[PDB]
Design a protein around this ligand. Sequence first.
Ligand SMILES: NC(=O)C1=CN([C@@H]2O[C@H](COP(=O)(O)OP(=O)(O)OC[C@H]3O[C@@H](n4cnc5c(N)ncnc54)[C@H](OP(=O)(O)O)[C@@H]3O)[C@@H](O)[C@H]2O)C=CC1
Ligand SMILES: NC(=O)C1=CN([C@@H]2O[C@H](COP(=O)(O)OP(=O)(O)OC[C@H]3O[C@@H](n4cnc5c(N)ncnc54)[C@H](OP(=O)(O)O)[C@@H]3O)[C@@H](O)[C@H]2O)C=CC1
Lengths: 284, 286
Amino acid sequence: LSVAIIGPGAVGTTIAYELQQSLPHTTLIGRHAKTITYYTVPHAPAQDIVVKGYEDVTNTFDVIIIAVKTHQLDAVIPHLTYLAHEDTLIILAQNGYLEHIPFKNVCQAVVYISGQKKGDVVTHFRDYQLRIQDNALTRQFRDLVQDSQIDIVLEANIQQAIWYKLLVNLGINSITALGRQTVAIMHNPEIRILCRQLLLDGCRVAQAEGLNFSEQTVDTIMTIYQGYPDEMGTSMYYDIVHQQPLEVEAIQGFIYRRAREHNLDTPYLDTIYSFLRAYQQNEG
Amino acid sequence: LSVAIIGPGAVGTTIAYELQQSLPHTTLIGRHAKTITYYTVPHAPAQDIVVKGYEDVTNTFDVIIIAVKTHQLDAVIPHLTYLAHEDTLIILAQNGYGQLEHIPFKNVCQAVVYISGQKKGDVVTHFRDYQLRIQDNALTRQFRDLVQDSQIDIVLEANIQQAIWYKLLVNLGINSITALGRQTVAIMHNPEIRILCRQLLLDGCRVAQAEGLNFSEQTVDTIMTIYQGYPDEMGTSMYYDIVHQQPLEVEAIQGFIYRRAREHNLDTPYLDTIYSFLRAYQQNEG
Ligand SMILES: NC(=O)C1=CN([C@@H]2O[C@H](COP(=O)(O)OP(=O)(O)OC[C@H]3O[C@@H](n4cnc5c(N)ncnc54)[C@H](OP(=O)(O)O)[C@@H]3O)[C@@H](O)[C@H]2O)C=CC1
Ligand SMILES: NC(=O)C1=CN([C@@H]2O[C@H](COP(=O)(O)OP(=O)(O)OC[C@H]3O[C@@H](n4cnc5c(N)ncnc54)[C@H](OP(=O)(O)O)[C@@H]3O)[C@@H](O)[C@H]2O)C=CC1
């Protein structure tokens, strides 16, 4: 069973490194060939991991994990024609919420792996977990990686897990990015009020999509946010302050488009999405 | 009838220059004596404008026009003890609202400012317009008459509340959007932004109504129409302030509207969201 990871970033390098410890043929693919210097944890002995460029990879793979940013998926897609066969299992190790991918077996994963890439140096911080829809192919993949540190959690129905992370992202990523601030911005009472209202907007969309969320869910997420230290950023905050594109369309945009589909009133979500969309269009 | 302007900036210098053309004893006052540069329009020949420092002034004025930013008003107030007599007409030529009561004088009036210009250091460039709108009363009628030979257009309003709130809304929509968006008005080419803009104006309208103003969806439409006339490169003062990492005039504008919304227990989600971010910026910069 052949395995590729596409996207040698924080998440992709972590997955490739750890899978290569038990499955040494596992292949890490980027735009061009290079070598990433990888730390399993901060201050660990450095480890180099080989990246093959698209042009270097001639064969097809049974499993392909895509770990690029959501706004980078469209650029990856055409390469799949040569990297995958009709039955290749394709796993999106990305945030947000597939139909753009012209293959039968495409699965959206929920990523619980924390790390950062600076230049060609990747530092993993904590966690090795992917939550994926439980099916024949993902069970087979789970079995394949059993001697690695990668924790594949199979969900009888992956929608709840996807939407839960969608909501966790929705509140604090929107606020820190639009606010151009670390999570310390939550010390403003008005910002916390906004954050809860924004989560409530997201929650009512999740509900109309058939998910079992509620005000309790919002309380739980606000409680998680209270645990974050002041200096903590979010991925969308880092992207906006470094003038990079945002993952907005697959996160706030997805939630927004579902809100409209259900004719919901979501003023907080709408406001947040309008500004993040405007940023994205300016960056284009 | 003597006139002073406090605040040698875009608005204050425009008013001083034009009033000095017909009322040469009109005095422009700043923190320190200097001579600044004024352009009547861009590329016009420079005009020297004399600025007297507070320490130089040894007389009172019958009319004092305060032309500073909203958050700068508190620092001006103690100087009025030395510049005004009991009956002095004080005109607060300033955006926002809710600050008139801070001025301990009986004759205090807001002016709604329709004068466009920019101050950079000691250089003021006027762009267009020369209008102030002020409540109609005996003292403002006397002031209007005084300045009749100048280019300054004093419009006396039967009820100044309307003009004040109209301007609050005009600021509320495009200044919040450009500032939070960190963009010129070109940001309005995004249809989602125009939808938000209109919803934001509607929140503002609902607050105005609770304050007793006859604003409606027609009012909102007229303001959206005005926005459609702005060229892409145009900024707003709040936009310029936020990109310059300066304090904003938020507390007397979006802040005031927000506090009135809470006072009336209204549901104003767009306004609340906008204010929450502008306030967070202000708390971080301060
Ligand atoms: N802690 C984390 O980092 C977490 C991340 N996630 C999610 O995981 C996903 C990946 O995030 P993350 O690893 O942080 O992102 P990174 O920016 O660290 O990695 C993305 C990688 O993909 C590469 N890439 C970009 N375009 C292409 C392309 N067309 N073909 C091949 N490779 C490409 C980039 O290369 P280049 O350097 O040249 O741009 C970069 O190496 C995101 O959706 C994120 O939201 C979720 C939880 C935590
Ligand atoms: N186009 C425009 O400029 C328009 C402005 N307005 C409104 O008019 C008001 C004035 O704005 P604008 O003229 O642009 O602002 P400016 O910053 O151009 O002018 C403010 C001036 O007041 C001076 N000042 C500040 N504090 C004091 C003090 N304690 N004592 C004496 N002088 C002081 C400042 O000094 P220093 O030079 O040292 O900073 C500056 O010269 C604002 O509320 C604005 O929203 C309304 C419509 C248009």
